């Protein structure tokens, strides 16, 4: 039952991303009272958590440190001046150590993302190795999440695969301008409904010459303006 | 600001839960792939997760290693032997451990959940203490937490404290037939306004006095019937 363990790892990162954005909030309100400033200077969550993490209390910040984040000098000398002339509280160092029980939470949460990413890669890669091919592995685990199965995604019509529309999310796709993305979408979910077939009946790969003839189609679609 | 800070860690706790909810029902679903009668054998999310966590595959499951969790043998043997003629199907060790994931970040919640308290008790002891000593830390940052702030919550009267009704979960309260319940929350009410008061002023601890009126006055309510 190889392919429902890959939704339920799609699954799992939907609700990651929930939670991360919850514990976030709550981090920026929370360390808000201490640092006001730096909730408006950093909208990246994975950022807020590692400097409330390493870092901790505004007056500990420094060049050399933020420079060791990969923040640019325009942006150092913003945060490092509000946290000077900073107008908020004074904190212990039990406030700071109980903030960071969330902040290191949020810091944990965004390296099991990233594993189960990897694991939704390897197991796509082979219970589904075409579909994969042809959008990727988030994409193509997100589909059979909404399908049900791989067997009950094998007998959707391409139609029915166009609307799940999702796939609209394909570069292909996003990219192209409103008017072309009809006929692309359309594309897809024919080489799709395929893919999805022959790895039902896990059959022989099919991913180069399938992702040849979408490139094909797509850019006779494009060469009709 | 130190209320402020109070409620933030409690509004983190609450956070805590919807998530640890959140990851059980996760984890209960994909783990139920692999063993789908756990689920309804265990009712309490951290033991479920305990058992993902350090067994792994129902197969590994033993009497002793489940009596190193406190399970009675009437209960280990419902589980050992649904962990033979289990209906559910078979996993690589892929997949355990990143089931596993999110097993362990509920395990870890437990803990911060656990050491948010700590902090919330060290906290609330000192910035109001004789609301802690009337309805303890927890509900006593709960009460701040929809009053906004301390001072906004010393400014309330008992008619209002009463509604905010929350306070209605004090034991002496909660454990009372519903008819006595109105006097008694009445009572909490009053006794929690004086407190929330000499708590904002900074003033002397009356905890215990506090706590000997509220007594009184609700024996002389229970013994009228």
Redo the contacts between chains.
């Keep these: 039952?190889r392919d429902?363990?890959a939704i339920?790892?799609v699954?799992?990162m939907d609700?990651i991303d929930?939670?991360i954005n919850?514990?976030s909030e709550?981090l920026r309100?929370?360390y808000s009272?201490h640092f006001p400033e730096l909730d408006k200077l950093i909208e990246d969550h994975e950022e807020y958590a590692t400097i409330v993490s390493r870092f901790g209390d505004r007056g500990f910040l420094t060049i050399d440190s933020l420079k060791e984040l990969g923040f640019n000098e325009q942006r150092i000398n913003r945060i490092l001046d509000a946290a000077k002339k900073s107008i908020g509280?004074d904190?212990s160092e039990?406030?700071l150590s109980?903030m960071r029980?969330?902040a290191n939470?949020i810091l944990?949460?965004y390296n099991?993302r990233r594993?189960?990413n990897n694991?939704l890669e390897?197991?796509m890669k082979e219970v589904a190795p075409n579909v994969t091919a042809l959008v990727g592995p988030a994409l193509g685990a997100r589909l059979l999440s909404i399908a049900g199965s791989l067997d009950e995604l094998a007998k959707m019509p391409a139609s029915t695969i166009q609307v799940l529309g999702i796939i609209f999310q394909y570069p292909a796709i996003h990219t192209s301008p409103r008017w072309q993305r009809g006929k692309i979408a359309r594309a897809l979910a024919a080489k799709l409904a395929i893919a999805a077939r022959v790895d039902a009946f896990s059959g022989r790969f099919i991913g180069d010459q399938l992702n040849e003839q979408l490139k094909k189609r797509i850019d006779e679609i494009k060469e009709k303006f």
């Design positions: 039952k429902l363990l339920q790892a699954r799992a609700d929930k939670t919850l514990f709550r309100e929370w009272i509280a904190i039990d406030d109980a029980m969330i939470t944990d949460l099991i594993n189960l694991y390897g197991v």
